[PDB]
Amino acid sequence: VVSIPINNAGFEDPFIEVVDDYTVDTPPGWTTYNPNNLVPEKRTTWTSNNGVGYVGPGTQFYNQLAPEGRNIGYIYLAQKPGSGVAGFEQILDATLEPDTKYTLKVDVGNFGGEFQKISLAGFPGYRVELLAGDTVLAADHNNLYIKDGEFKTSTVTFTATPDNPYLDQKLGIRLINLLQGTFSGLDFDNVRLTVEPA
């Protein structure tokens, strides 16, 4: 049960001082997964965007602290449900190796409360993907029910056989806002990828 290295796996970079303050730029170590061009290259608050947010004691968004450290990673899409998807992506250095089971865990948060007097009730759905090259090997497409104000752990597993056509391609992770619901924002934290024999 060795760990596979992921950059900024808990969105802890950058440091944020004030509770509930946030950035609006792609977190360092991740890129913006943008297959439908929903997220513009330059962002401000109230644009479709992603970034990190500080979920500290006293937070108005949850009934608990961050799953890990201070920060969560978030994705907010302004477009109406059905316009497409967006999220975060990271290609890893680890490659797909035969006779190995991979375990990917990430916590997913449905923030509640109010932003600028706008209700954050509701949820867009999520998908967590494990990749080799650009093939999605296994994914959790929105299986967990997650109430306003709480986080849950999504798990995705996959076993690579010596037959696998994608052996030796680089592993990837995607964390996606599905935009199938409003309020259309969600949080992610504490990305873990563990590898093991069979």
Ligand X SMILES: NC(=[NH2+])NCCC[C@@H]1NC(=O)[C@H]2CCCN2C1=O
Strand duo 71-76 + 86-95: pairing: unpaired
* CA–CA dist 38, 7 (Å, integer): 24
Does 56 show up as a binding residue in the annotation? no
Query: For a copy of itself, which stretch binds (CB under 8 A), given 1-9, 13-21, 43-51, 150-158?
Result: 150-158
Contact between 56 and a copy of itself by CB under 8 A: the answer reads no
Residue of 97, 99, 96, 98 whose CA lies nearest to 198: 99
Within residues 47-66, the interface with Ca ion by CB under 5 A covers 66
Q: Which two tokens stand for residue 41?
A: 């290259």
* List 138, 150, 152, 169, residue binding a copy of itself (CB under 8 A): 138
What residues have CB less than 8 Å from 113, skipping those under 6 apart? Answer: 60, 61, 120, 149
Quote the Cα angle for 18-7-73, to 5°. 40
Contact between 189 and Ca ion by CB under 5 A: the answer reads yes
* List 137, 171, 186, 193, residue binding a copy of itself (CB under 8 A): 137
Contact 182, 115 (CB under 8 A): no
| Cβ proximity to Ca ion, 42 vs 165, nearer residue | 165
Residue 158 touches which member of ligand X, Ca ion, a copy of itself, none, C-beta under 5-8 Å by kind: a copy of itself
| Cβ proximity to a copy of itself, 72 vs 156, nearer residue | 156
3-state secondary structure 144-194: CCCCCCEEEEEEEEEEECCCCCCCCCEEEEEEEECCCCCCCEEEEEEEEEE
Strand duo 86-95 + 170-177: pairing: antiparallel
The alpha-helical segments, DSSP class H, found in the chain are none
Contact between 180 and a copy of itself by CB under 8 A: the answer reads yes
Site string for Ca ion, 108-147 (x = CB under 5 A): --x---------x---------------------------
* List 146, 156, 185, 190, residue binding ligand X (CB under 6 A): 185
| Cβ proximity to Ca ion, 170 vs 194, nearer residue | 194
Q: Binding site for Ca(2+), residues?
A: 10, 12, 21-22, 41, 68, 71, 110-111, 120, 122, 134, 148, 151, 189
Question: Which residues of the shown chain bind a copy of itself in the complex (CB under 8 A)?
Answer: 81-82, 101, 121-123, 125, 129, 135-143, 145, 156-159, 161, 163-166, 180-182
